[PDB]
C-alpha cells in the first residue's frame, strides 16, 4: 500500500509449520514458498506456501521423495520449478549422520513433483551456506563451506534438459571474493552481486559484482567519504539481499555481535548507498539473521530467522518498494 511501509503480515501458524531459521524462500506466481530450515530441535524438509494476495499460509502438496531435511541449502526458481542444491544433512538431536550435500532436487509447482536430478560425471564439492542464482538458463553455485574450509569456486549446470545437462566449473577471472559463506546473492541487469558475508579473517563490507558474460569479478569501490555519501552497511553475515528496479536492498544479519535492523539501499547505477526511511505507520521488524527474502512485484517479503537469544521466528514482514 504505502510506499516504504513495513507491513507485518500474519505469521506462520504452528500447526502449519514450525518457526525456523537457515531456510529458503522462493517466489512463484504470487506466493512465497518456504523449504527446509531449523526449528531449534530438528532439521526440516517440509514445504509451505504463503499466498501474497490472500495472506494465508498452507502446507504445500508434495509427491515423490523430498530432499533430506536440511538447512543452509540454496533454492532458486527456473520457469515453473524450484531447484534445491546443497546444504547440511544429519540428526541434530543426536549429532549423528551429519554431512554436507551436493545433490540437486526439482519441485514442479504445477504437479507438486519432487524429482532428483542425478547428474553423472564430476560434481561440485558438497557444501553449505553457498550462494546461488539462476541466469541464462543455468544454475550458478558460488563459494560456501564444504566441511574443511570456506570456498570460492563457481559451478554451473544447465536447467533446460536434465537428460543432457552436466556440471561445469567456472574459470573465474578478476578480483574473486575471498573464501566466503553465509552471504546473500542478488542478480541485477546482467551482473551478480554479493555483499559482505562471513569470510573469516577477511570479513569486510565490500561489494562484489560478477559479470556473467566474461566471468569476471569486480570489487566496486566506494567514494562515500569523498562525496559525503552514506557509508556502506556494517560488515555482517546471515543477511539477505534482493534486487528491485536498479537498486539492491540489504537487511538483517549479525554485525559484530549485534543484530541491526536498518534497511540499506544500493544504487547500482550511481554507486551509492542509502538508509531507507520507513513510513510513519510502519510495523518495523526486529533484528534477525539467517532469515530469507524474496520479491513479488514491487514488494519485498521477509520470513523467519533467529530474532534473539536463539529464538526462532515465523513472522512475515512485507516492505513496499518506491
Amino acid at each position: 500500500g504505502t510506499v516504504h511501509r513495513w507491513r507485518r503480515l500474519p505469521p506462520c501458524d504452528e500447526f502449519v509449520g514450525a518457526r525456523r531459521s537457515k531456510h529458503t524462500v522462493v517466489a512463484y506466481k504470487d506466493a512465497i514458498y518456504v523449504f527446509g530450515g531449523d526449528n531449534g530441535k530438528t532439521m526440516l524438509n517440509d514445504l509451505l506456501r504463503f499466498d501474497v494476495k490472500d495472506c494465508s499460509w498452507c502446507r504445500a502438496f508434495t509427491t515423490g521423495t523430498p530432499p533430506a531435511p536440511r538447512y543452509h541449502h540454496s533454492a532458486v526458481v527456473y520457469g515453473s520449478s524450484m531447484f534445491v542444491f546443497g546444504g547440511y544433512t544429519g540428526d541434530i538431536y543426536s549429532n549423528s549422520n551429519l554431512k554436507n550435500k551436493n545433490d540437486l532436487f526439482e519441485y514442479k509447482f504445477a504437479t507438486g513433483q519432487w524429482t532428483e536430478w542425478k547428474i553423472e560425471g564430476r560434481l561440485p564439492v558438497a557444501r553449505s551456506a553457498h550462494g546461488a542464482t539462476v541466469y541464462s538458463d543455468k544454475l550458478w553455485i558460488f563459494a560456501g563451506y564444504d566441511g574443511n574450509a570456506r570456498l570460492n569456486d563457481m559451478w554451473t549446470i544447465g536447467l533446460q534438459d536434465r537428460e543432457l545437462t552436466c556440471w561445469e566449473e567456472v574459470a573465474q577471472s578478476g578480483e574473486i571474493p575471498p573464501s566466503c559463506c553465509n552471504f546473500p546473492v542478488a542478480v541485477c541487469r546482467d551482473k551478480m552481486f554479493v555483499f559482505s558475508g562471513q569470510s573469516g579473517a577477511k570479513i569486510t563490507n565490500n561489494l562484489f559484482q560478477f559479470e556473467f558474460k566474461d566471468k569476471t569479478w569486480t570489487r566496486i569501490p566506494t567514494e562515500h567519504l569523498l562525496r559525503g555519501s552514506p557509508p556502506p552497511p556494517q560488515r555482517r553475515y546471515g543477511h539477505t539481499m534482493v534486487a528491485f528496479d536498479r537498486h539492491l536492498y540489504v537487511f538483517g544479519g549479525a554485525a559484530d555481535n549485534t543484530l541491526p535492523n536498518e534497511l540499506h539501499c544500493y544504487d547500482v547505477d550511481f554507486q551509492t548507498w542509502e538508509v531507507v526511511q520507513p513510513s510513519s505507520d510502519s510495523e518495523l521488524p526486529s533484528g534477525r539473521l539467517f532469515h530469507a527474502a524474496a520479491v513479488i512485484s514491487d514488494a519485498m517479503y521477509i520470513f523467519g530467522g533467529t530474532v534473539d537469544n536463539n529464538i526462532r521466528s515465523g513472522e512475515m514482514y512485507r516492505f513496499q518498494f518506491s
Binding site: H72, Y88, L98, A129, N182, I203, A254, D256, L289, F290
Partner: protein, 175 residues
C-alpha cells in the same frame, strides 16, 4: 592424513587469539580485532607422531556460522579458556562446558581447561587451585598459560591430541 579439528572456547578478551597465534607462528598479536573468527592450521609432531591440527579461534555470540556450526559438531577436541584476571570469564567456563553437551549430547568430548594471562600475577582474580578443582570436576587436563611470553602454550594443544588419541583407542578396544 589425520586431521584434528579443535575449537577455542572462552569469553571475550581472555586471549584466545593470542594463544592461537603463539601456537601456530610463535608470535604475539599487536592489536587483534576481537570480532574475528577463523581457523588456522599447523603440523606438529606429538609423541613422535605427526598430526595435522585445524584450530578455530571463535568470536561472536549470535547464531553460529556454517563453519562454526560444523566445527562444534565435528570438532574432536575443545579448549575452554578463561583469564586469571577475569573471574567473570572463569564462571562462563561452565556455560561453555554445558554448551558442548547441548551440541555433542555427551560430556566425553575431549576438553582441556586453560587459565590464560598467568603473567598478570598482580591482577590475579582466579587462584590456580580453583582451576585445578574445576578441571578435576570436568575430568580434563588443566594448564595456566601466558600467551604474552608463550608459557605452556604447546603443552595445551599437545595434551588435547593425547586425549583424542586415548579416547579413539579406547573405542577400538571395545569394537
Amino acid at each position: 592424513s589425520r586431521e584434528y579439528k579443535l575449537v577455542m572456547l572462552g569469553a571475550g578478551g581472555v586471549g584466545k587469539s593470542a594463544m592461537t597465534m603463539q601456537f601456530i607462528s610463535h608470535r604475539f598479536p599487536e592489536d587483534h580485532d576481537p570480532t574475528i573468527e577463523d581457523a588456522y592450521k599447523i603440523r606438529i609432531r606429538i609423541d613422535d607422531e605427526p598430526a595435522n591440527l585445524d584450530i578455530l579461534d571463535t568470536a561472536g555470540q549470535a547464531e553460529f556460522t556454517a563453519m562454526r556450526d560444523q566445527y562444534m559438531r565435528a570438532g574432536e577436541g575443545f579448549i575452554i579458556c578463561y583469564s586469571i584476571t577475569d573471574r567473570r570469564s572463569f564462571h562462563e567456563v561452565r556455560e561453555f562446558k554445558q554448551l558442548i553437551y547441548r551440541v555433542r549430547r555427551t560430556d566425553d568430548t575431549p576438553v582441556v581447561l586453560v587459565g590464560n594471562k598467568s603473567d598478570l600475577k598482580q591482577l590475579r582474580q582466579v587462584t590456580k587451585e580453583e582451576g585445578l578443582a574445576l578441571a578435576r570436576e570436568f575430568s580434563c587436563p588443566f594448564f595456566e598459560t601466558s600467551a604474552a611470553y608463550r608459557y605452556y602454550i604447546d603443552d595445551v594443544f599437545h595434551a588435547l591430541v593425547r586425549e583424542i588419541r586415548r579416547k579413539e583407542k579406547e573405542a577400538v578396544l571395545a569394537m
